[PDB]
């Protein structure tokens, strides 16, 4: 219990109020309430902005100064940003407080403390009662019940066998493990047979309470907590929605769990192809692919679904936002898909915070909006561990019931089919605390902090880029708008000169406009997509605005090697693009390290420092090649290779044309089960049907799904695979990743259906 | 670091050795090694038997006394039971040790310490070096690498978003949650992109090391760590094995994950029916159901598989051991099924320790045996959290490659299909520590401790039962052999009089013999099944040996209510049977509480204590019925109801006859997906096809699977459901559980396929 | 919480049982259970006959002496004369206790503590659980509910006017009166 006391000047002579406050602080310490005494509102504001738990605020001001009134109101608002229901006591002389009494005072003051005419013991008792009341409502239901049950230490005669961690403390290695992970983790692993807490699979007790709380917080009709991640969540949604006699509309930018759901359901997929830009960044699906006529055309043209052209599709999935932070206008997507489907699934695995900041308005699934009765059913999956605060494997399913809704009894079958009978309650507790953390003022405050950090990094990088350009030097630039317009006053700013409040408040500063060249998605409609500020992509020089390489540049693979050497691991990477994640776990000013690392890379690149000094791990791959070679020598070698081979055109060819479909993904997988598959080298792939999905990095989305033909000799897909293989052969230590292939003696092998 | 010093009398005058040992202890304390000095080998043995970590043992004896030599050898053997590689220093006068030097001495002594002619500093340095060497090899690979990486605190720019728990410490509730679960749990949640540790799904790095270690420890060719429990493990095995064009042989005593695998694969199942006894305990499948002719007959008689009589079945699953501790002779089962199948899956979810105690020899899958080349492929699934020491959702897949084996590339597809892309590494670490805990001497020692505790409980209960019977009173009796025979000397003992060593050593003391009446499995072959000692069933009086009820008895539901009131929750329960689990997390002498609780129940039952005083929660269900009623009044009411209705015959009728099969489980589930299902009351179930499985408790195994007909008016299955419903109506607060039903206003509803 | 340990001679050599009991007492003190260690049943009887609250009894005897068995039974009966449901733990070597196991033993023993082969931490945890179970049933209903409610200190807006004794602490004579009679008397006047 900690009480914060902030008073400036209550009496004309300081000693009276100081002695009264000292007596109160002594009485509070005698009841085990720690006290922090602060004499200035700016100091109190600084104290509050440190993530220190405050159980009660007692403040007093001059009471005749409007400036101190404004400062006190600011202090209380700041306190309630992240500590929402902390009691506030007004310390004041009685007459001064009574003449200032009004509705606005009572909006922020919970109790009165007549510090100059009341015993410190009475005030201390009231403060303690208020603190206890505040603490009793602080925790979310599941976490509260788990903590309450954790004090039980009796041997139950049932599983789990470790019995609250006792089993581990019987060998020395078990004792080390038990001491490392701590007792409370094992004492919450209690099984699903303790009625005090409830059961997750039955959605009873504290688990039912937590799911209702999460549905309220995230704006869903029903919510389901999942302990198998968004992979499991996607599987259960797809299992509840489609059947092998169904046609489904699949975002080609789909996670592999979507293809797993296709395999497990046997549905026949039709694909909407997303757009691409000159950097190899996958962009949004254009509205021309979601229109009812486009979907009917796709169904009529598909070899497997052409006998189902009269059948309404049972399910559609759109990934929003994308891996590179492109956010759809979900309202417009829903309106477009409403003309063809009754079920829309938004895979928002990376997009869980979007509801809690106004910058994302209309660009997510569970919007605060008036809902009509003819809406489609909407599903949203959040990976709570990705960009929210939860342990790995924690996930949510959010449902908004509309047309052709699935009731609880039917949905529970799929839910159980992809779950476990013994969930780990720590994962569910992390889900519950994440939902609580986004609840109320705190979600807005946390999203604001992350967005502001990302904006500071973007503006600093843009400023440095302009400085180096003015000195006719190269540098990295952030991937966002070059110029932003203030919609109120009409004034234009360079991005690095724009006021931070404008960038934090105005959505149009992040919308992809068709007239702008920065995003590179040609023919995108206006007010369709938007850039997520906290997914920061930086661009290495070398790519022209027209789509062709420049005379010189710095490939991103070398910068990635540098960052890995310094511990920074980017989320995504193309030839010239590096993506950095700003999360709610970042601390303020941390991006200075990133800027410093990029500057030191530029220094060593301009100096052509030998790779042995700077990047010994790169040398250790091929010491005969990279030995006696400098940083800029390797960079120019890579850029010359890129200029000669132009793999970006290969990527565009491979992803603009869809492969020929021979069978459903389920049929292809059942070929694997029947042992009718073989490993085929890339040079022999012509005419072969892939047994599993091929996902090259870049662009990180599947080029081929299971049951799709590789194509003839001139197929762009085999060509792209060959290009990646050639790059791997030419540059050891900078090898591309390609899911769905086996690399034997540096050569690519693909599992294919035997003819 | 703790060193144990055990010396008795090294010199004719005690002061010399005492002063030398004091100097050594001082020098050891100066290097931060804690020392425990013990003057007697029995005291040292007692110290070792307390689960205290000992890093080094320094001992000395008389060196001319053979009794002290035997005692010292016993002490070292006891120490290495659970602390296997702890260094042992011999403290001795040089000449005495040298004259006693031989191979047998060096088998247990690692180093010499000439305590009377060497500086204490030199010996202390050598002891410290030995302790460091021992500590450096103590942890298993994955746990060691995770602990080593946990010291890193830098902000990675990738998921998970909480970034080692930093994200939680930004709201007060998050801070409470973070402090409760501790920092190390969040700092190990690092994602699959840290190459220092490796990746679970790629089986690389420390994860590959841990899986190889587990395969060695559990005697498998390959092992897979699973974070979705045995449900997930069963799903991936079944997905890798069968296809919708396949016929499979399914143990009717199957977990619901087996039916989920059937739904997800579309295979056509044929069932082997297990046996039952008079207590409603499900027993083993008899050999007459596994013969090739029996399987061919089942295939030819099945409505769905009768067009596949020439097709070899692709998969079989047997649950071993069963829920009530019946263990198959797995060697004989494998020999029987080898004549019909190439893949046998042993679902050993409750049976993970069996390899590590000789009492279970030949009664588990991965046996230490000479393996021929014509064996079938064997799968075994262990739920490491059930009866081993692991967190919930931890599981293993063990494979022994034989006929029609599945190579790694093909199996990995199913493995990924039922996994998540973001596993929680704490679960894998718990799997690794569980495997390490069963490794070497420690697995034998831990299984021995659990078995001895269960035997002590069984013998004490049998003795009390005999005492009460001699006083012509009733009591509970353990479900095991009444008389055991010593195979060496031929001597017979009553079970409560048998030597504990005989029961712990001789397997035949637990084998179900056809001539014995205790197990009640009529016509069981000899040396076919065996009782697991640590799954202790107790029998309430009331059931005759012939199969019919006696004139009086105590129903087990009331005893279960009593135990629940005292916190004990049994694993399984029938009309007269209560099952208690003894796990490796139990402490010695804990079963005294169970005995005390049963005795106090008997006292209150004989005294007819009013239910308000003893069981207020029972009264709170139906205060108008249970008010003003005693314990024995309720017991006799329940027994009269059982005598009148005889639900055991209903259970026997329902489970001896299989329901008519109308479609595969996948077809029935796809009816759910197509919304062609409805909730049907029990009285209207005639002719209806169940959409999901119906699992009544008792007997806790499915009575109907998905796609099976309920039957006509005289169907035993509808009759059994009606019996359970009638019991629930007559006795509020003692309601049976039935998975697959909905209970609306106390009435049973079953989801059925629309006709 | 106070635990009474009464053991006389469990092993042929005293040091083994003494060291085991010392370890158990240390583990009990680390969980805030005060321990009284007594080596003779007559001394334990004298201790019990002093009106001192005992929350748990842990005892061990020779286990082959019928006289010590009679003395231990007398000690437990004396303890339960005025402290009726105090848990009784038997400290013993496992084999000796198991050969002496019968109905008459279980009539007076609630739990077993294999002091020579069990960790002192496990036994201490079980002792603490037993003590908490015993303490939770000790008070009669009205007294228990009054004590539970007495922690509330909020100003109700109803009578009695003194409001848990706060009203008395406003004059010096009232403060003397309030300190004399104590706070809990006024906080139960609700």
Numbering used by the authors:
A (entry chain O), B (entry chain T): 1 to 755
C (entry chain G): 1 to 190
Reproduce the article's own wording on this structure.
Moreover, as we observed P. stuartii Adc by cryo-EM with the goal to solve the structure of the decamer presented above, we discovered that most of the Adc double rings were linearly stacked to create double-rings and longer filaments. Consequently, we solved the structure of the P. stuartii Adc stacks at pH 6.5 that was used for protein purification to a resolution of 2.15 Å. The atomic model of the decamer stack reveals that upon polymerisation the conformation of the Adc decamer remains extremely similar, with minor changes localised to interfaces between monomers and dimers, and at the interface between decamers. The inter-decamer interface is mainly stabilised by a salt bridge between D472 and R492, both located in the AAT domain and respectively situated in a loop following helix α18 and in a β-hairpin. Remarkably, D472 and R492 are replaced by G472 and T492 respectively in the solved structures of E. coli and Salmonella Typhimurium Adcs, providing an explanation for the inability of these enzymes to polymerise. We note that the isoelectric point of the decamer shifts to 6 upon stacking, in line with the burial of acidic residues at the stack interface. Specifically, although the diameters of the LdcI and Adc decamers are very similar, the height of the Adc decameric ring is 105 Å compared to the 90 Å height of the LdcI decamer. This height difference, resulting in a 95 Å repeat distance between successive P. stuartii Adc stacked decamers compared to 76 Å in the LdcI stacks, is caused by an inserted β-hairpin in Adc, which contains the stack-forming residue R492, as well as by an approximately 10° rotation in the wing domain.
Bacterial homologous lysine and arginine decarboxylases play major roles in the acid stress response, physiology, antibiotic resistance and virulence. Inducible AAT-fold basic amino acid decarboxylases (LAOdcs) have been studied since the early 1940s1,2 because of the link between their enterobacterial pathogenicity in humans and their ability to overcome the aggressive pH environments and oxygen limitation in our gastrointestinal tract. These enzymes decarboxylate either Lysine (LdcI, also called CadA), Arginine (Adc or AdiA) or Ornithine (OdcI or SpeF) into corresponding polyamines while consuming protons and producing CO2, thereby buffering the bacterial cytosol and the extracellular medium to promote bacterial survival under acid stress conditions. Here we show that the Adc from a multidrug-resistant human pathogen Providencia stuartii massively polymerises into filaments whose cryo-EM structure reveals pronounced differences between Adc and LdcI assembly mechanisms. Like all proteobacterial LAOdcs, the P. stuartii Adc monomer is organized in three different structural parts.
